[PDB]
Structure formats: C-alpha cells, structure tokens
Amino acid sequence: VKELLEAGVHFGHERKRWNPKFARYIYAERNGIHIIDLQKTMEELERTFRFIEDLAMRGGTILFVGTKKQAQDIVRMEAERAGMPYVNQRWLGGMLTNFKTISQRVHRLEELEALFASPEIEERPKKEQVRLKHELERLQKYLSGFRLLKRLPDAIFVVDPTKEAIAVREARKLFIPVIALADTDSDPDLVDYIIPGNDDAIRSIQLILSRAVDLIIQARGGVVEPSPSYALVQ
C-alpha cells in the first residue's frame, strides 16, 4: 500500500489524442508522448485510496469495470481476491440504470445451474437440452461476477473512463462515485476519484489494482500476500 518511485515505466502514456482537460496532470511532451505529472499521480492516489478505505470499512462494494483487453485478465483476479464484483467481458446497456431488468439474467444463471444438478438434465427433450445448455454458456460468460451484485454498488472502479464511458455515465445518473484509472485521453472532471496513471499497459494497471485491493483487504480484515497476477503479466 504505497510506492512512489513506482514510476517504474508506468508514469506517462498516450501521444496527442489528449483531452486538453487533462492538461494539469501532464509533465511534458517528451517525444510525441505526454508524460504524467509524477507527484500528482501519488497525491491524487492519497485522497483516492483514502476514499476506498472508508468503503471497505463501512462494508460496501466496488464494481470493477475493465473491458480493455490489455487489462481484462487482471481485473478478474483482483476482483475475485476482494469480494467485490467485476464487469470483464463487455458492459451492457443498463447494468446499473436498468439493474433490475438486467438481473433477470442473474436470476436465470443461478437457477439454470440448478437444472444441471438434477434429474431434469436427462428429462426434457433434447430440443430444449441443446438450447438450454448453450444459453447457460453465454450467461456465465458476461455475468461471471456481476451476479455477486444484489443491489447497486456504493462505488465503481473503471480502468478506462473513455473506453468504458457508458459505465461512467450510468454511475453518475445514479449518483454512484466513480473511481478510475485515467490518463491523457480522458475527461478528468467526469471522474470523482482519479488515479492519473495510464489506462493501457499491464505494468501499470495491475500495479494499481494490486495495491488497491491490497488496501481493500488490508482494511476489511485479512492482511494478505502477493497476488495471483503479479509478475505473471507478460
């Protein structure tokens, strides 16, 4: 739960497709790439991790949203490590603003797996058997850890604001605090708690969600060890 000269190589990123609104968090245009104000990344982190502490203490959940493939797997472990839910494959229209209706898909998954521990997987025609077993396929594929959500989450952790911007918009419309791993292509003001790092490159990404989940466990009550991911990021 720290590291400051964990610039490592995960400080600055992105070329000139910036959101000029991200101007404060930049250090220079070192050869076609804005590099991120190192200090600010650490002090925004201060007020940020602070936020997340009180969330684990009060016993609420954080929905980890990362769809970007260069961060996809990482989300799965760190979100499984902590109890919290994750949206991993792709983000659906109304996971939040339509959160009731979307949860029928959860009502079915949990209940369709109950078909697969019964005598009725031998019963039922195979007209149903083929359809109703490759339907369970897809369900577990998108809601592999949305099903953990039983109500709207107290906050939400996105790894790319720009890319998962439908996720962001939904959060706001329901007044759900946005934590985000952001960099130069994003609108910082659209985000409540910003870690101005860089949405792409696993060396960042995982470092952040490691230390974040470290802190979540550390503050919930468990004080643990290295992660399932770590330097298993190639």
Partner RNA sequence: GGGAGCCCUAGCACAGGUGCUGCAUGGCCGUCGUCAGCUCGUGCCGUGAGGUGUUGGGUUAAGUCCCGCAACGAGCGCAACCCC
Q: Cβ 77 to RNA, closest distance in Å?
A: 22
Out of 90, 107, 150, 203, name the contact with RNA by CB under 7 A.
90
Closest by Cα among 207, 223, 226 to 42: 207
Give the nearest distance from C-beta 93 to RNA in angstroms.
2
Binding mask 139-178 for RNA (x = CB under 7 A): x--------------------------x--xx--x-----
Per CB under 7 A, the segment of 35-43, 50-58, 102-110, 193-201 that binds RNA is 102-110
The structure tokens listed for 74 are 């990482």
**What values do phi and psi take at 177, rounded to 5?**
-45, 125
Strand runs (DSSP E) across the chain, as ranges? Answer: 26-28, 35-36, 62-65, 86-87, 155-158, 178-182, 193-196
Residue 98 is a binding residue for RNA (CB under 7 A): yes
- Nearest distance, CB of residue 208 and RNA, angstroms: 24
- With CB under 7 A as the contact rule, the residue among 7, 72, 76, 105 that binds RNA is 105
Q: Does 138 bind RNA (CB under 7 A)?
A: yes
**Which position among 49, 64, 86, 91 is part of the footprint of RNA (CB under 7 A)?**
91
User: In this complex, which beta carbon is closest to RNA, that of residue 52 or of residue 143?
Assistant: 143
Task: Tell me how far apart the alpha carbons of residues 117 and 110 are, in angstroms, rounded to a whole number.
Answer: 12
Instruction: Decide: residue 71, CB within 10 A, 0-12 exposed, 13-18 middle, 19+ buried.
Output: buried
Binding positions for RNA, 209-228, rule CB under 7 A? none
The only residue of 8, 60, 94, 228 in contact with RNA, by rule CB under 7 A = 94
Angstrom distances, CA of residue 106 to CA of 54, 76, 101, 109, 147: 29, 18, 10, 5, 6
Tell me the C-alpha distance between 120 and 129, whole Å. 9
Examine residue 126 and tell whether it contacts RNA (CB under 7 A). Answer: no
Q: Which is nearer to RNA, 12 or 177 (CB)?
A: 177
Query: For residues 211 and 226, what is the distance between their CA atoms, to the nearest angstrom?
Result: 10
Neighbours of 197 (CB within 10 A): 25
Whether the Cβ atoms of residue 93 and residue 166 lie closer than 8 Å to each other: yes
Residue 103 or 218: which CB sits closer to RNA? 103
Q: Which residues of the chain form contacts with RNA (CB under 7 A)? A: 90-94, 97-98, 100-102, 104-105, 127, 134, 138-139, 166, 169-170, 173
